[PDB]
Structure formats: C-alpha cells, structure tokens
Amino acid sequence: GVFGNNEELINKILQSSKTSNEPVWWLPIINEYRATLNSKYADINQISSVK
Amino acid sequence: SEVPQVVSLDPTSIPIEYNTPIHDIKVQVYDIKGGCNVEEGLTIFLVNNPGKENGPVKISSKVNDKQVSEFLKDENMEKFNVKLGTSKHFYMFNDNKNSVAVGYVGCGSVADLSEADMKRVVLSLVTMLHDNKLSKLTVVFEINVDKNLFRFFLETLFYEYMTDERFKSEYIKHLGVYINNADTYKEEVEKARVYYFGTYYASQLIAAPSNYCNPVSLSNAAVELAQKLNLEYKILGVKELEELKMGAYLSVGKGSMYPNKFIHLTYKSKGDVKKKIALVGKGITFDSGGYNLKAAPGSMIDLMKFDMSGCAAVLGCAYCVGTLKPENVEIHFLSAVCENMVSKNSYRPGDIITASNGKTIEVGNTDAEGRLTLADALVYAEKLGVDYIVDIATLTGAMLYSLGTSYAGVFGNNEELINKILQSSKTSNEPVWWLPIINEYRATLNSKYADINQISSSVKASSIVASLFLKEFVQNTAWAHIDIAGVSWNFKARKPKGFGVRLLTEFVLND
Amino acid sequence: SEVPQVVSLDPTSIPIEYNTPIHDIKVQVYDIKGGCNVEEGLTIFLVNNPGKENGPVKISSVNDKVSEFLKDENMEKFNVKLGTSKHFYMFNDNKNSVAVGYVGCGSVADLSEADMKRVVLSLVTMLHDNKLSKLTVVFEINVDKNLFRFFLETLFYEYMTDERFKSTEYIKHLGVYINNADTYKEEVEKARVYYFGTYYASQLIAAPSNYCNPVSLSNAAVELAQKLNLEYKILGVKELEELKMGAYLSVGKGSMYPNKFIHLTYKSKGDVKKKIALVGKGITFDSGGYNLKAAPGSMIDLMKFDMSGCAAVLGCAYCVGTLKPENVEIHFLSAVCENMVSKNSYRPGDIITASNGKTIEVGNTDAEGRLTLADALVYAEKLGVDYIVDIATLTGAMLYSLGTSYAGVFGNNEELINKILQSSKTSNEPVWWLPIINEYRATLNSKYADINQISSSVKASSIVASLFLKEFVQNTAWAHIDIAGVSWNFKARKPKGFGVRLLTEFVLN
Amino acid sequence: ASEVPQVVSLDPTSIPIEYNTPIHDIKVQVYDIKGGCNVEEGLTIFLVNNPGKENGPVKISSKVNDKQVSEFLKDENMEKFNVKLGTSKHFYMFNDNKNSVAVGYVGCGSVADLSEADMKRVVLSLVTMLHDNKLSKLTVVFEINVDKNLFRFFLETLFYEYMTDERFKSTDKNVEYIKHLGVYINNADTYKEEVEKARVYYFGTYYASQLIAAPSNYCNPVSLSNAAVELAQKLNLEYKILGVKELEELKMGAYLSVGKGSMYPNKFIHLTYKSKGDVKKKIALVGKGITFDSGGYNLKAAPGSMIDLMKFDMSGCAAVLGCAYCVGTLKPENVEIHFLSAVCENMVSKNSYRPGDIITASNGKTIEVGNTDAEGRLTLADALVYAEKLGVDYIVDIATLTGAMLYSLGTSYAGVFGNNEELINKILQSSKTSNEPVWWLPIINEYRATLNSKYADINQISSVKASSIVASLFLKEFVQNTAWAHIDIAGVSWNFKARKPKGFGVRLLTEFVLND
Numbered sequence A: 001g002v003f004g005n006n007e008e009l010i011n012k013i014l015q016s017s018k019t020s021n022e023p024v025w026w027l028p029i030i031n032e033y034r035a036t037l038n039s040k041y042a043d044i045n046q047i048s049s050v051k
Numbered sequence B: 001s002e003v004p005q006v007v008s009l010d011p012t013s014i015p016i017e018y019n020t021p022i023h024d025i026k027v028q029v030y031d032i033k034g035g036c037n038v039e040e041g042l043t044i045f046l047v048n049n050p051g052k053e054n055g056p057v058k059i060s061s062k063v064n065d066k067q068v069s070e071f072l073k074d075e076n077m078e079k080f081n082v083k084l085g086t087s088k089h090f091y092m093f094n095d096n097k098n099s100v101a102v103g104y105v106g107c108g109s110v111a112d113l114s115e116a117d118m119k120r121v122v123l124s125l126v127t128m129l130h131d132n133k134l135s136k137l138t139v140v141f142e143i144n145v146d147k148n149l150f151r152f153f154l155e156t157l158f159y160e161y162m163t164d165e166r167f168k169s170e171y172i173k174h175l176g177v178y179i180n181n182a183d184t185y186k187e188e189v190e191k192a193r194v195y196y197f198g199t200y201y202a203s204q205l206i207a208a209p210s211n212y213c214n215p216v217s218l219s220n221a222a223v224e225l226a227q228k229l230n231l232e233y234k235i236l237g238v239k240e241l242e243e244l245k246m247g248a249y250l251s252v253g254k255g256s257m258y259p260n261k262f263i264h265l266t267y268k269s270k271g272d273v274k275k276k277i278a279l280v281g282k283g284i285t286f287d288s289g290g291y292n293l294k295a296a297p298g299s300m301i302d303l304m305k306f307d308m309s310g311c312a313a314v315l316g317c318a319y320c321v322g323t324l325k326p327e328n329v330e331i332h333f334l335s336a337v338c339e340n341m342v343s344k345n346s347y348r349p350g351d352i353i354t355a356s357n358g359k360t361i362e363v364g365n366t367d368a369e370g371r372l373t374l375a376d377a378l379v380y381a382e383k384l385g386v387d388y389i390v391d392i393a394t395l396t397g398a399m400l401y402s403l404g405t406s407y408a409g410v411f412g413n414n415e416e417l418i419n420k421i422l423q424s425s426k427t428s429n430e431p432v433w434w435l436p437i438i439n440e441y442r443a444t445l446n447s448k449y450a451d452i453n454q455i456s457s458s459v460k461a462s463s464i465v466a467s468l469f470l471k472e473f474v475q476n477t478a479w480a481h482i483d484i485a486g487v488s489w490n491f492k493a494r495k496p497k498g499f500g501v502r503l504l505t506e507f508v509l510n511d
Numbered sequence C: 001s002e003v004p005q006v007v008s009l010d011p012t013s014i015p016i017e018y019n020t021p022i023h024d025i026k027v028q029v030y031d032i033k034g035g036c037n038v039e040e041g042l043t044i045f046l047v048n049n050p051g052k053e054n055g056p057v058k059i060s061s062v063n064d065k066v067s068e069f070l071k072d073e074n075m076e077k078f079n080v081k082l083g084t085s086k087h088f089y090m091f092n093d094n095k096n097s098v099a100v101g102y103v104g105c106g107s108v109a110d111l112s113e114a115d116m117k118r119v120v121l122s123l124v125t126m127l128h129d130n131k132l133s134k135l136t137v138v139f140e141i142n143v144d145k146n147l148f149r150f151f152l153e154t155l156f157y158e159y160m161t162d163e164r165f166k167s168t169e170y171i172k173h174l175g176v177y178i179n180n181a182d183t184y185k186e187e188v189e190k191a192r193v194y195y196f197g198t199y200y201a202s203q204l205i206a207a208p209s210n211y212c213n214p215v216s217l218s219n220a221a222v223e224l225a226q227k228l229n230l231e232y233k234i235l236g237v238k239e240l241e242e243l244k245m246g247a248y249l250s251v252g253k254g255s256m257y258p259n260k261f262i263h264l265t266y267k268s269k270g271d272v273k274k275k276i277a278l279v280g281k282g283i284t285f286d287s288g289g290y291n292l293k294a295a296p297g298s299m300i301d302l303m304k305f306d307m308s309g310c311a312a313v314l315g316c317a318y319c320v321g322t323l324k325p326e327n328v329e330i331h332f333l334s335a336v337c338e339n340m341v342s343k344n345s346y347r348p349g350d351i352i353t354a355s356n357g358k359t360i361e362v363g364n365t366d367a368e369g370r371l372t373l374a375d376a377l378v379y380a381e382k383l384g385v386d387y388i389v390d391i392a393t394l395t396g397a398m399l400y401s402l403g404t405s406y407a408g409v410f411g412n413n414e415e416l417i418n419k420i421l422q423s424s425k426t427s428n429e430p431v432w433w434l435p436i437i438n439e440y441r442a443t444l445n446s447k448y449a450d451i452n453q454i455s456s457s458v459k460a461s462s463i464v465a466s467l468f469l470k471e472f473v474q475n476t477a478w479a480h481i482d483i484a485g486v487s488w489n490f491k492a493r494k495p496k497g498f499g500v501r502l503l504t505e506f507v508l509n
Numbered sequence D: 001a002s003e004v005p006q007v008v009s010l011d012p013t014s015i016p017i018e019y020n021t022p023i024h025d026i027k028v029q030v031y032d033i034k035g036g037c038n039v040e041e042g043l044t045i046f047l048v049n050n051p052g053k054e055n056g057p058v059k060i061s062s063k064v065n066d067k068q069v070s071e072f073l074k075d076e077n078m079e080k081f082n083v084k085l086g087t088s089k090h091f092y093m094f095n096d097n098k099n100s101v102a103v104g105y106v107g108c109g110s111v112a113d114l115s116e117a118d119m120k121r122v123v124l125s126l127v128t129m130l131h132d133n134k135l136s137k138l139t140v141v142f143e144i145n146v147d148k149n150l151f152r153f154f155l156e157t158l159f160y161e162y163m164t165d166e167r168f169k170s171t172d173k174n175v176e177y178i179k180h181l182g183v184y185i186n187n188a189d190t191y192k193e194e195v196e197k198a199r200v201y202y203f204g205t206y207y208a209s210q211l212i213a214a215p216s217n218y219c220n221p222v223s224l225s226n227a228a229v230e231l232a233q234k235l236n237l238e239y240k241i242l243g244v245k246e247l248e249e250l251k252m253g254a255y256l257s258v259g260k261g262s263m264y265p266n267k268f269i270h271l272t273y274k275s276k277g278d279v280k281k282k283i284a285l286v287g288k289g290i291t292f293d294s295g296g297y298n299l300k301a302a303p304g305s306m307i308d309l310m311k312f313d314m315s316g317c318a319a320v321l322g323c324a325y326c327v328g329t330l331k332p333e334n335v336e337i338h339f340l341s342a343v344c345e346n347m348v349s350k351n352s353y354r355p356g357d358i359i360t361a362s363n364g365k366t367i368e369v370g371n372t373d374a375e376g377r378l379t380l381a382d383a384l385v386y387a388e389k390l391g392v393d394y395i396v397d398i399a400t401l402t403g404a405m406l407y408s409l410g411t412s413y414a415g416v417f418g419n420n421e422e423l424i425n426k427i428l429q430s431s432k433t434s435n436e437p438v439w440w441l442p443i444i445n446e447y448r449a450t451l452n453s454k455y456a457d458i459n460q461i462s463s464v465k466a467s468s469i470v471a472s473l474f475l476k477e478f479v480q481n482t483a484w485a486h487i488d489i490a491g492v493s494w495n496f497k498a499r500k501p502k503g504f505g506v507r508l509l510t511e512f513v514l515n516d
C-alpha cells in the first residue's frame, strides 16, 4: 500500500511500481480519523483507541 | 404475504414514517450580498477564520436589526472562537420586542470544507435544534460551498434533525438560507428533500429490529413502496426460486422460520431506453452466522439486523428514482432477501450447494452467507440483459481494518463503471475508495471437490477474495461491488447512516 | 400439562422424593447437667479450646464408667482444629459395642455460619461410612436457639443423599445433649421442615433440564400446592398473550416447551397486616440463546441451575404451607420458560414489549432472566401487595462481588432491605446489601426503545440489572436477592437450596 | 531528594507540578439573595429547578436590582425554557445603564435534593458555558437548596472541571480563566466558611490528579518521592524517605521483591503532621504507590487489561499526598497524621521476582507468590506492618487494588473493608460529608482458607474469584491489634469518558481526619 500527501509523488510511486513490477496500491489518508489521535495531555496520540 | 408468528405478540409489519416533520419545512434561499433579516426564530452564522487556527469569531454580514447588530459587533464576537463544530447561541429581543435567538457554528480555519467537516458543522446546528422550540431557523453561509456541498448540507441537516420514535411509547416550520449566488442553489433544495427521505427510508428499514423487519415484511414493504411510486414489482417465492435453481440463495434461508423472498422492482422511462441498469443489494434481515455462530469477541451480533443495509440502500434509491423520474433509463432494483439462522433445518459448513448457473460451491463458513445469496442475484441480474450491474453489501467486517467507518470500497471487472461510481461518490459526497481485485488470489478459491470455494482458508484479504467469488457469477457484463460493511452503521450515534442511497441515485441520474 | 417429547424415552415428569429417611428419625433432646449415657450407636462431643493452635481436647460431664476413654490424658493426644475428627469403637458397661468420638470446633467460642457447616460435614462423614442406628451429639460449645436449628437443618441436608437418577442405612434415632434443653426443643421440628423445604428446592435444581422443563416444573408446583393445600393457578401461552407479557414470551419462543407462569398463593387464617409476593427466576435451562454460552467460564453444563430462584420459591411454599404462619398473605410466583437456540428464538437486537407497555431493546439474548422477571414484577405489583421480594440467579458478576457464600440484595426501600437482612441473621443464609446506583441508569437509555435490556459497557452487571428491574416497580417496596453466586456448591457438585430458609424467616418475622 | 536515573538524557527527571493555578487567582465573593442580585459584566447564571414537575417551566424568583433585567427574566418570558437536569440557555440584553449584559440558567431538574452525580451534571453544564467564552467574571445564583457540604462540593467540582491540565502540551494550546466569582445564596454568612475550604480541597484533589495523570517516565518511584518531599517542605511537614538499604534492614521482603525488576530504587514515603496542641488521636494513612503496573511476569497481556492506563496504579498514594496538602493547609487541632506510601514499579526483567517465589514480610510471615500482577497487596502488607509500629489509633489504606471493583460497584462507588465497625462507620460518614461515595463491603472469613499455602505461611492469591474480598483477607493478616480499613478505589480512580483522573480520596480522607 502507498499513502501520501502529494498526488504527483504518489503517481510516480505507482509508475515506478509498474516498471519495477513490484505491485503497489494507492490507499487514502482519511482526515476524519485524525480526531482519534487527539490526546488529552500530549500534543498527539501514537495510536487510536478506529481500527 | 402473511408474516408467520411464533406468538401472537410478534409484529407482522415494519412501521414506516412517510410524512416526516421535515416534509413540513418550507425552505427559502436568499442572496447574501443583500444583507440579512433577523425577525423571527433562530439565526445561525456559519463562520471560519482562514490562517488563524481556533481564531476569533467575526461576522461580516449586515443585519437589518439594531439590537442584533450590537450583539454581532466584533468586540462582542471576539469572545468566541471558530474551532470546527464549536457553537454559542443567545436569546434576545430585537427592535420590535420579539424573542429571537442568534448564534454561530465554527467552521474552522480551512477555506475548503470536506464531507466530514460539513457533517460536524451540521451536528452542532442540530444540537441547538433539539433544544429549540422555535418555528424558524435561518442559516447564514459566510463560507464557501459548491452546489453539491450545499445540497449535502441540507440532506445531512434533514437526516440528523429527524428522530425515529416508532418503537418508543417542536420541529421548525421554516428554513432560511443566506448564500451567495442564491438562485443557482434554489434548485438543490427540493432535490435534497428527496435524497433526504430515501436515506431516512433506508435508515428506517435498517434500524427496524429483526422481529419487525424479516424477509416477508421487508418484501411486503417493498411492494407497498412500489405501489406508492408506481414501479413494476415482483416478489419471487420459494417455489419459483426452486424452479430458477437458486440453490445458494435458498440454502442460506433454510434454517429460518421465514420463507425466502426475492425483491424485484422496476423503473421504466416513458422515453426510449438507452441504459438498462440492475442494482443488487444484500438482504440478510439478521446474520447470526448460522452454525458458524457469531460468538467471537467483536462479532457485534446485537447489531446484525443491519445486514440488509445493501437492500435498504437499493430501496432508498428506488424512492429517489421513482420520485425524480429520470429519462431514457430502465432500472432494476434487486435483492435476494433471507435470514441466516441456527436450526435443524440450517445448512452446514462443508455443504456443497449449486448456484443457478450450474456452478457447484463448497461452503467453508456459514457466516459468509451474503456472497452466496448475491451469487444467485447476480445470475438473475445478468439474464435480464442490462448494461450495468452494481451490487452494494455489508459483506466483510475486514473493511473496518482497511478503510474504516467512513469510506466504502468499490471493486469491479470494468474500469469505466468503477470510474462512474467514483464520480457518483464525488457528487453525492458518500465517500468511496477503489480497491483491487487481485487475480493472483483466485487460486485460493479452487475447491478439491466443488467448482469453487465459498471462502479462502489462507488469504486474509477477505474483501478481495469475496469479490473474486462474486466475479465468478457475472459472465459477460460490466459489474461493480461496493462493500459498505464498515460504513453502514454509525457506531458513535448508535444509528444507521443510510449509506449508498445517494451514491446509487447519483449513479443512475448522471449516467 | 402434558410434557411434549422428541422421542418416547424422554422423561415426562420430575421424580420427587417426599418421604426421606430424615422424616423417619426419632429426635430427643436432654440437658447436659444430668450426665450422658452411651447405650447404643455413636456419641459425638462438640468441644473447643480458647487458647488453641489448635489445642488438645477436653471432655466434660458420662454415666458409664466409657468415661475412661474420654479421660483428659488420652484425649490430649488429639487437637480441636476446626473440622478435625476421630472416633473409636468400644464396649460399655452393658458389654454392648459402642462408638465414641469428637469434632473440633476451633477456638473462637461463638461459631459462625461457615464454621458450623464445617463441623457438620465432619459429623456427616462419620455417618456416611458407618452403619449406625442412633447418633448422639453432645454440645460442649455454646450456641444460640437459631444456630442450633441451623445445625440440625444442615445436618439433615448434608446427610441426605439424592439417588433419583441412579440405577447403581440411615439412623432411626438422634440424641442431643445440650444445656437449657427445654429452650431448644421448639427448634427441632422447625428444623426438619426447613430441611425438607431446602432439600426440596435442591431436588428441583439438581433435576436435569430434560426432566425439569417448564411443563414438568409447573406440574410439580401443582402437586406441591395440592398436598400442601395452597391455591394454585398456572398460566399457559394463551393467557400470557392476553396479558401481553411480551418480554417473558420472547425468551421462550425458541423452546419446545410452552411457557408456564406459576402462581401459588398462601392466605393466613389470621387477619392480614402484610401482603407479600415472592418472585423467582425460572429458567429451566439457560443456553444463552443466540448469544450462546460458548465463552470459557460460561459453565453451560450447569445451567439447569438457572431456576434456583423458582426452586427456592417452591421450597419456601413448603415451609409456609407446613408451619402455617399468622397475619400474612403470600404469593409464590415464577415465570418459567426455556432459553434455547432455534429458528423460532428471539434475536439480539429484537425490540419486545413488556406487559406495562415499556418497549425493550434486546442487546444480549443471554440476559434472559431480567426479561422474564420484568413481566413477573408487573404481575406481582398488580396483586396489590405491600412487599415484593424477587430472588434470581441473575448475574455471574456476583462471583466477582460477593463470591460463593454471600448473596447480594438490592432494593428501593430500606425497611424491606432491613427485614431481609434481619432474616439473613436468623436464617443463617448470608446476604449482603448492595446499592442501586441511579448514576448508572443512563447506560440503559436506548436509541429506539423506551429502555435498553443491558448496558454496553458498564461492567457493574448486577447493579445495571437491578436498575433494569426497578423500572418495572412503580409504587411498591421491592428487594431483589441475587443468588447467582451462592446457589451451587461447586466443591460438593450439588445445589444448596439457598433462599428457602431466608424467605421463610422473612415471612415469619 | 534523590537523583532520578535515566536510560537516555532525554528522560524526564522530575514531575511537572502546577501549584499556582488560575483557580487560586479567582476572587470569590458571596452575597445574600435578600439584598437582590446585580447583573454585572461577565456572565450571570441562575441555578433553577421546579419541584415535583418534570421538565417543567423556568421561573426566576430572586429580586434583580435592574428594571430591564427583571423584565427580561419575568416568567412570561421564561416559561418557554425548561429545567431538565443539565439543560442550559444563554441570554443577551441591555440593563438600566444601557450596558450589554449576559444572563442564563442551568436546569437543576425536579428532585429538590440533588445527588452528587446530579450536581456534577449541573456543574458540567456550567463549565460548557465557561469554555470557549472569554469571560472575566462568572456569577452563580442559587435558587435551589443545598446544604453546606453540597455547596462546598459545588465549588470543589466547579474549580476541578474548569481547570485544564496543559503540562504535557507543547505545540497544542489556544485561548483565559475568570478572575472573579460571585455567588448569590440565602443565608450567605453561613456558607462563607466553605469557600476557602473548597479552594483547598479542590487543589488537594487536582494535585493528586496531576500526579496520577503524569506518565510513568515522568512519575516514577524516585520522582514521586521527590515531589512528596518537596510538598512536605512547602507545608512544613516532617518527612522521611526510606531507600533500599533501610528497607532491607527493616526486612520488608514483600515490598522489596515487587521493585526488584525496576530501574528505579524503591522509595518509602513517610510524611507526618503534628498539632502543637496535645495529641488526642494518631492516624496512619497508607496509599498504594505502584508508578506502573506491567503485571510483571504475569504480564498484562489479556484484552481487558488496560496496560496503557497503569500509570494510575499510584492513585492511592496520590490521594494520600493530596490529603497531606489539605491537612497541611487547614492545620487541624489535637491530631497526629502519618502519610505513608511504599512506592515502586512492577516490571519485567532478569531481576524481576517470579510467580511461585516465596518471600518474607517484615512481620515474619512468609508469602507464596501465585501471581506477580497481584503486587499491590504485597507492598501494602509491609506498609501496614510499618504503619502499626507507629502506635496509631487508626490505620486507613487506599488502593487501586482489584479490577473486580468494576464488576461489583462500578466506576462511581468505592469499596471499603475493615476490622472495626466504628472505623468503617467513621469512613462512611466521611463519605457523606465529602460527597465522595463509598459503600461498605464484607471481609468474608469463609474465604480465608483458600489463602492456606502448602509451603509458605500464606498465599498471595486464591486459586475463588471474589478478588476484592480475598485481597482484604490478605491485608487483614498484617494488622494484628489495631483498627484498620481498606478502601478499594480501582474502579473509581480513572474517569474513562473524560479520559482523566478524578483524584478520588483526597476529600474523603481529609474529612475523615477533621471530624473527630
């Protein structure tokens, strides 16, 4: 699986995947799940409590 | 058909609300460039603050009321911030000594609002309404929304505002909207109200417990829906299902006290037909798992009336299509409805059953019941001679591990159809992500004795494997499969989402 | 009334022993001051020793010169460790062979509920391996009038052996030497009655579920009512439909046995200054339903025990019907059914309607007891009674809370709680008061129904369940006795018949 | 003051503590309702109910010394709103001086006597009005009846929830605490004494909360004992911290074994308060101080285990130090109090103690370990032996001991066990006046036999699921002839929904020390 913050880079990853013949699939970074990392005390949680 | 009972106190029909209080709301849209009137009711400003995170609230719209303008001055509003979803509202008297409420909902610091961002904004509004007895709500959009997102706003507002009290023992009458380019958005209002009910209608079917919503009662409700819309309808019973040789579907329901019922609605255009579309929905009114009983920690068996969400999504689409009445199109709404139960009459792990296309199938897990019924529905669908077959189903719990509770996955054998669905996901704002059918896993379905395995032994990646199974029952037609298992139920709100209704409708309307 | 069968070899009734060898035992009680004589059988001295580790035994009295065996020098070789025992056989003055011995009662002077039980098991052990015709017991320790009765009751119960289901002896006389004997004599026949009431309950609980089903159990209740002389009424499905008991009826939907609501009634010849309803959970087998008991620890092979509340209720009916109390009206209630897996069963998620109109969302088909108890409490309150006491094996959490010795009681009225606690003291069946915390009520707020059956969370399972039941009592003092932890004796692999003596002491006081 | 060991230099060497909180900067003024209410600057809130009528209409019943604000609050206008418990509404209006003021209410239901949970629900609603609003002044008007204790409880709880812990934030923080608090109530002069008593109890509670919320890399045996020393110094309390060598001398084999696997040396905390008066009662308070409970070789690996929460296993100690603050501040008369905690960390190592190991307590009793995750009773055992040698009238210990508390009493009520009815009844009474709910649970002697070890004097655990009772039976064996009580707060210490500690026990223990 490939995740990213930039479509140009991701597609380059996909393009390299095609020519290297090492298969990779694009998966989404879903911002709605970001709130599950809101820690009560630290700046951020390491993990969710959203499987 | 007569719904069988064990005792006389067992319900014989699903209660359905057709006339909702939402249908009583007169909606008016005004242009923002002209300023706001704040006479009656509750007035809410949707405000953001670009580049300053949790920044101060600043209203920037002239209001034709001196008492409310003093309230909305910057010195007073800077006492609030725009953190997404945050809200404040005050009750006060305006210039003519009438009681009004004014407030805001924070829309963050990001110009571009998402499908999720808009949902949290809407919930904040809804929280104020569930505490409000007033007759009018006015919403002022000091943010950017396209025509689609504005419709999504109304749909979501409508959906959340409505409360289901069928099993229990002061709604607004007017909705005002100030938005830029108002006249372009007016056409979205009544389209939203339709999309609203289709989703809520599906919601009612899903939320209905399995003693209320069973194969017979759901098929009866489908007929009743068809009669109110005027759609051709046909319910296939066991005897006909036996002569169509639908052994996979029929096996699944053997252990139920309720006869199998196959739902077939049809919309036909008065036009000439340039597209035939079949929509297929998973219709398991309760998934106990059968002899593969759902007893493992996490199985969520208390939630398993929801396993007919796909079917509900299809009926929800049927309402919208039957109401909006698109042209040049013929739509078949299909669902092989049954109940997956434990009994002496139940089918067993290891049983080899024969689908209606002649393929023999070895059952390895009776809780993989959905793909077995869908198999027969897909064979039924393709013989209809359609251009597109789209199935939607709460098929695999694995989706929770892959895409989660917000995005559904779409699989298919045809890239154009997949692309059309993604486009439909993008204009309906019901998020879908394209997932692969990896052909290399196909060998894991090779049975030693039967034509094909029902499940793999091996290859965790069950969502793909389930799609590989389904692909075997569509021979020569463009087909797509949407797993809504992760997204169907709203776990936080303890209610259904009615997911898929708007997605499928946008697919038939914009194609 | 006819028990349905799958095959002809299936039992159509519960076998019941009414006339036990215990009812055949001659009991007489003497004052220790007159001395003891050791004619026939086995004579046992109950002795303690304040300042023991445990310390040596010392006897004190015997009108037969054998006084010498029990001399201080020989007896000092044995110790008084609670439960320790030794008995020796000898020839007496009349050249007859007699057996003499001791049971150690520790050093704590006033013996408790548990400790006295340990004494009895030790006594019973000697009786089970010996062919005695008479047993004589000497109390060289001090006990209450109530604890003595408890001694007798427990003795009788542990001594009795259930052989109903076997394919492949008892003493006829019991002697007791104690001081102020004339004060204890009234306790003897009361004990034998409490014995059978307890043993009767034990018989019902121990009866396997193929023998003890909703029909066969309701039949036994009628037979009990008939011999006793108690007014009886048995509700079948058609009158339960009437009455709209949807919660109770859903639980039994998956069973091959029709639901039967048991209603026995006792009315005093006195004038009635108290009307009491006793309600018992009567699940003849708890499979758990679609929430099948498949998890480790569920003990599904024991779930015939899930009608212990019902059994306790009928056992109480025996004592009440026999002892015939004054100024009391008692209703013996149990909504009996079976929780099974079937095409006809109720499902997780189902919304059902109780007889008071409240809609209930089922979250776990294994939370079946509170569903049946809900309708029973509505029915109970409709009789227009002053006190409602329900007793049920409701929650396994009780094992984590109080364990296997003390039962928990919950309630809405402190006086009723006070009477139950007082009854626990004189009945010597240990009970502890637990709180109904209203702060947890919100966990039952359903999205669709009037109320949730269970919490989704809130591991305070016993308290949440008590909260559930309380919603079905509007204006009556009600207490709830949870015997899920105390009903079964795991070590001895038999029932305790817990609650029979507790409930009876409650109506008597 | 000892040196906190580090594995890397980035390891924290002290627990951050906020002593001077924005709450302490708040000027609190109390007025009598009979003089009327002035509707100021800031936000003015009415606490209203409607006795015997459920979700009934709102009616203000206190003279407002403003014609414009009286007119707005006339009930013609107010009955469109209801008093449903937790409900709240905001009002905007202009007063007699043509100034803009804010007014509102919080519904207090229909039950007249508000329980502690109800009042919390009232307070939580108040805090929502305080959050996201930049008020400079908050005014509360009591149109409901509360006794002196419940009024104090109102303040304590208000302060607690209003306060936000930002010690461990760096790149996350945003907007502003009120500086003034006005209270309108009838018979105000009787309630004035509760104000500063609340401010103290609040912080003792928040102080305990801060220690518990502190993660185990911050809050360890050394850093926690350091914080206790530092606290004693600010309060002029006598302190002594026992290290490994003294604990060895004192032969505390049970306590010392538990800490063998930790990189942090064991630290025993002993604070003391003595009145200049003559001492007429001596009390020992013992708190469980496991800075992290991994479970040891009985590792917490089962699904319900809550291993990320186990920094909270020193809540008992935290309540005790929190009590020390309150006592050290209020300075009670004729009393001598010992604040004790055997602090350590239960870890997995080559040096860890093993399941099956037999250890010797300071009173000579040999103990067979059956489960290393039952480490708390081992530390309390030596702490209780230490406590009794001090020659006190009462020994009260408080601990997150058994998860069974969640199955028995839940998350709201703590359990108390004991060997003396008069002590149990003083603790229960303290629960009433502190409004920290506690319920009396039994120590069942029939269960003592399962602690009968084949080789050691006694087993650490049974092999009988009544864990809280068995643990109490264990502890009872380490108090010979002194009145003793055990408070199991395992279920009530952490607020799961809020995702924070409660600081449970501070007010209960403090009230217990004060009312004799």
Ligand SMILES: CC(C)C[C@@H](C(=O)N[C@H](C(=O)O)c1ccccc1)[C@H](O)C(=O)NO
Binding pocket: C286, C288, C295, C297, C298, C364, C366, C367, C368, C369, C393, C394, C395, C396, C397, C398, C400, C461, D407
């Ligand atoms: C299903 C209900 C919760 C009742 C159930 C019960 O308590 N089940 C649980 C289990 O043993 O798995 C459990 C035990 C202790 C603590 C928490 C949960 C009881 O056995 C019953 O079926 N009564 O009808």
Ligand SMILES: CC(C)C[C@@H](C(=O)N[C@H](C(=O)O)c1ccccc1)[C@H](O)C(=O)NO
Binding pocket: D293, D295, D302, D303, D304, D305, D371, D373, D374, D375, D376, D400, D401, D402, D403, D404, D461, D467
């Ligand atoms: C097991 C111990 C004797 C005490 C321990 C405990 O009670 N654990 C729970 C229990 O026994 O109910 C639990 C165990 C496994 C899985 C889930 C929950 C407590 O957490 C602790 O370690 N205190 O120090």
Ligand SMILES: [Zn+2]
Binding pocket: B287, B289, B366, B367, B368, B369, B370
């Ligand atoms: Zn399934």
Ligand SMILES: [Zn+2]
Binding pocket: B284, B287, B307, B367, B369, B370, B394, B395
């Ligand atoms: Zn399914």
Ligand SMILES: [Zn+2]
Binding pocket: C286, C288, C365, C366, C367, C368, C369
């Ligand atoms: Zn059950």
Ligand SMILES: [Zn+2]
Binding pocket: C283, C286, C306, C366, C368, C369, C393, C394
């Ligand atoms: Zn049960």
Ligand SMILES: [Zn+2]
Binding pocket: D293, D295, D372, D373, D374, D375, D376
């Ligand atoms: Zn532990």
Ligand SMILES: [Zn+2]
Binding pocket: D290, D293, D313, D373, D375, D376, D400, D401
């Ligand atoms: Zn611990």
